[PDB]
Design a protein around this ligand. Structure first.
Ligand SMILES: [Mg+2]
Length: 658
DNA sequence: TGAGGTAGTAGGTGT
DNA sequence: ACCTACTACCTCG
C-alpha cells in the first residue's frame, strides 16, 4: 500500500520580488557562447533568450569586455533592458530562475575557505589518508527554483580521491604510473603514456615562461582528443590522477543508506547556514509499494538459478557443444550432472557434444563448426583460460558467423564456485534459446520492447531493440544493413516493425498493445513514425523514457528500505526503485517519463518493475533496468565489440549477447 | 570471460 | 542533462 519517503532535496525560502525580477541586459556580438558572455560579465548572470538575466546590480558587471572564443574573437556589448518579471509556472522562465539559483550556489561555494571545491561539489571531512594522498568526504550539490517559486536544494554525499604530491614524488616512493595525470596549476587532464630519458632544454622553457616549486624528469603525455599523438611534459608540474586501482594496495567508499541519509541531512544543514536562504526542509513524497513479481520456472522460483533444479519454464530438445582450450578433455562432471538434472526436471531431451577442432585450424575449424550446427548444436560452452579481449572478440565473432552463440567459462574451475558456473550455464541455455523463467500473471501490454542507441544522442547511427512477448518469450532485433547515417525515425520504426513481424509469426496476429521503453538521451520525436505506425495499425501503446541517472535518492521516513517503490512526481514523471540490497550501498531510483499513451502511471510502474525480474542470465541478482532495456543495452554493446552486420544464422530467441 | 549495483576515476553531445 | 568507459568492492532475491 502506501508509504512516505524523503527525497534528497530540501525546501528553502520562496524567492523575494527582487529575485523574481532579474536585471535584463541584451547583448550585441559581431556577427551559443552566450554562456561565455555570462561568465566574462561576472556576478550572478545567465542566458535569457538572446539576452542576459542577472541578480547582480549593474554596478558590479563588466559590460565592456573582450570575449576571447576558440574560433572567432567576438565583441562584448551588453545593454540594460530594465527588469523582467518571470512566472515560476512558466517552464522557460523558471529555467532561467533556476540557472540563476545554480550560479548563486556556485558563487557562494567559490567564496568558501578551508574546503575542497569542484564545481557544485564540496568536500569537507577527511575520510582516509596516505602515504601521499587523502580521501575527502562531502557532497555534490544543486540549487534551483520550484513551480511554487521557492528554492530547492539537492544534496548527495560523495568522496573525492586526491593526490597531494607531484608525479615525481609519487614515483619516487615506488608507486607505478597512473594512466592519467593532471596539471598542478589547472584542472586539465592528460593520459600518461610513458616516461622519457630526454633532457628538458634539449620544452622546459615553455613552462619557464609561466613557480614556487621544482621540476623533475620528462613525461610522455597525451590529450584525450588525440590518443595516438604523444606530447612532452614535466613530472614536476604534474599531479597523479588517483583511482581505486592506484590505491589498491595501501578505504571503504560505499555508504549504508542510513548513513547516506544522515550525511545528506547534515551537509544540507551546513550548506544551508552558508547560503542564508532559510532552514532546509527535507521534501517528503507519497510512495506506493508494488506487488511482488511471481517468477516461474517449471514451478515457482525466487530467482532464475532455481530453474536449474526446479526445471525451466519452457524447454525443448537441446544440443550443446563443448570447446576446450585449456588442454584437457570432456565435460567436467558436475557441469554435466547439473545440466542433466535441469533438463531432467524439465522433461526435455539433452544432448552433449564435444567439438574436436581448434581455432588454429582456420577453415577446418569453421567447417567443424558448420558440421556441429548441421547436427543440431544450438550453443557452445567454451572452457578456456582467461582470454585477451581481442581473442575473446575474435573467437566469439567466429562462432557467431557460423550460427553458434558461445558462453565463455574460465578455468581453473572448481565445483564449489557454484555462482560462477551456474551463471555460465544460465547464459549458455539462454544462448541456446531456452526459456528458463517467465512471469506468471496478467499484463496490459503483451509485447514490451526496449530500444537502445548505445547511449548516443540519436538513432541516426543505428541501434537495437529487444522484446518480451505475451509466457516470457525473449527476442532480439538488429537493424538491417545500411552502415551509413539514416533518418532516425526510420531506424526506430524498422527495429519495431521487425519486432512486430516476429510477434505476428509466433501468434498469427499483431499484439493488441505494446509497451515501448527507451533511454533518456535521444529526442522523443525520433519515435514519432513508430507511434503513428502503431496507430495506423490500431495497436495501442505507451512510450516510457527510462533514465538511469537524475533520479536522485529515496529514503523511507520510517522502517526499512525495500524494493519495488513507485514514487509519482510532477505530472507525467515518476521514480521507480527497482532493486536494492543492504550490502550494496544506497539505491539509485530510475527516473521515468510517460511520453505517449493513456495507461495510468501506476500500471506502467507495475509492468516495468515486474519486467525487471525477467533477466535469464543473472541467477542471483536482479537488474535495475527492465529486461528489454537491459538486454538491448548488452546487445548494442556486443554488436559494437564483435563488428556484426548481417547476422543470419542465429535465431532471434538465441540471446547470443548475454 | 559470472553476474549484479554501487562506488571511485575520467570523458562525450598545448607541449 | 542525459549518456559512455574503466576499475574496485562485496555478495549471491
Ligand atoms: Mg554472458
Amino acid at each position: 500500500g502506501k508509504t512516505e519517503v524523503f527525497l534528497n532535496r530540501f525546501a528553502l525560502r520562496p524567492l523575494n520580488p527582487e529575485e523574481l525580477r532579474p536585471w535584463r541586459l541584451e547583448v550585441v556580438l559581431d556577427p551559443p557562447l552566450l554562456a561565455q558572455v555570462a561568465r566574462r560579465a561576472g556576478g550572478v548572470t545567465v542566458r535569457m533568450g538572446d539576452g542576459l538575466a542577472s541578480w547582480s546590480p549593474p554596478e558590479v558587471l563588466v559590460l565592456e569586455g573582450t570575449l576571447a572564443r576558440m574560433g572567432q574573437t567576438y565583441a562584448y556589448r551588453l545593454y540594460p533592458k530594465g527588469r523582467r518579471p518571470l512566472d515560476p509556472k512558466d517552464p522557460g522562465e523558471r529555467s532561467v530562475l533556476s540557472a540563476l539559483a545554480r550560479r548563486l550556489l556556485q558563487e557562494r561555494l567559490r567564496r568558501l575557505e578551508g574546503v575542497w571545491v569542484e564545481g557544485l561539489a564540496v568536500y569537507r571531512r577527511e575520510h582516509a589518508r596516505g602515504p601521499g594522498w587523502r580521501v575527502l568526504g562531502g557532497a555534490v550539490l544543486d540549487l534551483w527554483v520550484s513551480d511554487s517559486g521557492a528554492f530547492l536544494l539537492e544534496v548527495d554525499p560523495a568522496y573525492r580521491i586526491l593526490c597531494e604530491m607531484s608525479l615525481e614524488a609519487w614515483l619516487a616512493q615506488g608507486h607505478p604510473l597512473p594512466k592519467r595525470v593532471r596539471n598542478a596549476y589547472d584542472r586539465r587532464t592528460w593520459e600518461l603514456l610513458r616516461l622519457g630519458e630526454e633532457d628538458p632544454k634539449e620544452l622546459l622553457d615553455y613552462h619557464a615562461s609561466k613557480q614556487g616549486r621544482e621540476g623533475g624528469r620528462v613525461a610522455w603525455v597525451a590529450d584525450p582528443k588525440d590518443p595516438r599523438k604523444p606530447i612532452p611534459h614535466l613530472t614536476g608540474l604534474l599531479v597523479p590522477v588517483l583511482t581505486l586501482e592506484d590505491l589498491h594496495e595501501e578505504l571503504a567508499l560505499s555508504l549504508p543508506w542510513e548513513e547516506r541519509r544522515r550525511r545528506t541531512r547534515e551537509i544540507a544543514s551546513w550548506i544551508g547556514r552558508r547560503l542564508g536562504l532559510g532552514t532546509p526542509e527535507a521534501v517528503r513524497a507519497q510512495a506506493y509499494r508494488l506487488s511482488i513479481p511471481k517468477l516461474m520456472g517449471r514451478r515457482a522460483v525466487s530467482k532464475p538459478a532455481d530453474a536449474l533444479r526446479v526445471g525451466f519454464y519452457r524447454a525443448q530438445e537441446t544440443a550443446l557443444a563443448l570447446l576446450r582450450l585449456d588442454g584437457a578433455q570432456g565435460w567436467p562432471e558436475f557441469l554435466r550432472r547439473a545440466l542433466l538434472r535441469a533438463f531432467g526436471a524439465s522433461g526435455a531431451s539433452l544432448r552433449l557434444h564435444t567439438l574436436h577442432a581448434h581455432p588454429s585450424q582456420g577453415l577446418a575449424f569453421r567447417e567443424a563448426l558448420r558440421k556441429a550446427k548441421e547436427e543440431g548444436v544450438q550453443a557452445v560452452l567454451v572452457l578456456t583460460p582467461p582470454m585477451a579481449w581481442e581473442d575473446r572478440n575474435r573467437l566469439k565473432a567466429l562462432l557467431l558467423r557460423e550460427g553458434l552463440p558461445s558462453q565463455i567459462l574460465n578455468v581453473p574451475l572448481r565445483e564449489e564456485e557454484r555462482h560462477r558456473w551456474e551463471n555460465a550455464l544460465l547464459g549458455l541455455l539462454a544462448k541456446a534459446g531456452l526459456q528458463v523463467v517467465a512471469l506468471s500473471g496478467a499484463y496490459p501490454a503483451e509485447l514490451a520492447v526496449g530500444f537502445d542507441a548505445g547511449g548516443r544522442e540519436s538513432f541516426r547511427f543505428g541501434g537495437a531493440a529487444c522484446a518480451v512477448g505475451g509466457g516470457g518469450h525473449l527476442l532480439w532485433t538488429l537493424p538491417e544493413a545500411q552502415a551509413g547515417e539514416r533518418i532516425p525515425q526510420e531506424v526506430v520504426w524498422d527495429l519495431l516493425e521487425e519486432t512486430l513481424w516476429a510477434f505476428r509469426r509466433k501468434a498469427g496476429r499483431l499484439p493488441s498493445r505494446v509497451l515501448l521503453l527507451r533511454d533518456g538521451r535521444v529526442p522523443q520525436d525520433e519515435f514519432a513514425l513508430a507511434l503513428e505506425a502503431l496507430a495506423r495499425e490500431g495497436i495501442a501503446y505507451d512510450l516510457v523514457s527510462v533514465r538511469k541517472s537524475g533520479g536522485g535518492r529515496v529514503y523511507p521516513v520510517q522502517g526499512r528500505l525495500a524494493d519495488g517503490l513507485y514514487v509519482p512526481l510532477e505530472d507525467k514523471t515518476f521514480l521507480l526503485l527497482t532493486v536494492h540490497r543492504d550490502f550494496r550501498g544506497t539505491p539509485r531510483p530510475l527516473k521515468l517519463v510517460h511520453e505517449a499513451g493513456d495507461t495510468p502511471l501506476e500500471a506502467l510502474a507495475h509492468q516495468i518493475f515486474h519486467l525487471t525480474r525477467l533477466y535469464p542470465a543473472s541467477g542471483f541478482a536482479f537488474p535495475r533496468l527492465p529486461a528489454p532495456l537491459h538486454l538491448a543495452d548488452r546487445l548494442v554493446k556486443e554488436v559494437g565489440r564483435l563488428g556484426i552486420r548481417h547476422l543470419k544464422e542465429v535465431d532471434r530467441e538465441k540471446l547470443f549477447f548475454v
